[PDB]
């Protein structure tokens, strides 16, 4: 399948080169997979989600996304126009308040929630979790991310936006999950992207168009935007049978575009997520 005039990041993940604008993908499109977006919530009524999104958990007085961030990330995973995996099921877990903040104990609870809750959902092709959030190093936050991964969920986490080594942030620094840095449309490391040995992969993260609250759309930047590209890619590849939740991060790194990015510090992988789809 081909989607013309796609957001640059979708085109980038199906291309060997920057500078194109059509997204190419197998029409299975992540059908039969599930992606949990652990964030500020999801505006599931947005037409772009087509009934495939739902809130399943909140830790606040409401499940509504009063911010937009979680809706944007969910849109990059799986919206019809802005998403990588256009037929995945999206599940919202609101661990962040409408200011975008949350206590680590709530974030931990949300991760353990997903590890259990997937047993209440139909995801025959597999389960992914997208965590576009983080803070300073916490062994308890890392352990929760490790448990979620161990339970059979492909965990993708943002590297962080400090232009610093991600070893000092969580859950970015957990080795067993998939830690995602950000790139721009000219194949430069995004100026704010964290780096370091703990990164597994880069995805598009500067000037990413996606869904927003109020039935709208907007372009924003962050490792938060790169992470759902990788989460959606994992769901798509799992539906194709190419990999599994336990192996998807390694598979994505194995099959990534290699050496294309500029300003990658020595010791950080030069790997850009790529679906290897041949139309």
Coordinates of N, CA and C in Angstrom, one line a residue, residues 42 44 51-57 89-93 121:
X42 N -6.0 9.4 25.6 CA -6.2 9.5 24.2 C -7.6 10.0 24.0
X44 N -10.3 9.2 22.2 CA -10.6 8.1 21.3 C -11.7 8.4 20.3
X51 N -12.7 4.3 15.7 CA -13.3 3.3 16.6 C -12.3 2.3 17.2
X52 N -11.0 2.4 16.7 CA -10.0 1.5 17.1 C -9.3 1.9 18.4
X53 N -9.5 3.0 19.0 CA -8.9 3.5 20.2 C -9.9 3.5 21.4
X54 N -9.4 3.2 22.6 CA -10.3 3.3 23.7 C -9.4 3.5 25.0
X55 N -9.9 4.2 25.9 CA -9.3 4.3 27.2 C -9.6 3.1 28.0
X56 N -8.6 2.5 28.7 CA -8.8 1.4 29.5 C -8.4 1.6 31.0
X57 N -7.7 2.7 31.3 CA -7.3 2.9 32.7 C -6.9 4.4 32.8
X89 N -5.2 -2.0 17.3 CA -6.0 -1.5 18.4 C -5.2 -0.7 19.4
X90 N -5.7 0.4 19.8 CA -5.0 1.4 20.7 C -5.7 1.4 22.0
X91 N -4.9 1.3 23.1 CA -5.5 1.3 24.4 C -4.8 2.4 25.2
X92 N -5.5 3.3 25.8 CA -5.0 4.4 26.5 C -4.9 4.1 28.0
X93 N -3.8 4.4 28.6 CA -3.5 4.3 30.1 C -3.1 5.7 30.5
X121 N -7.5 -8.6 26.8 CA -7.6 -8.0 25.4 C -7.3 -9.1 24.4

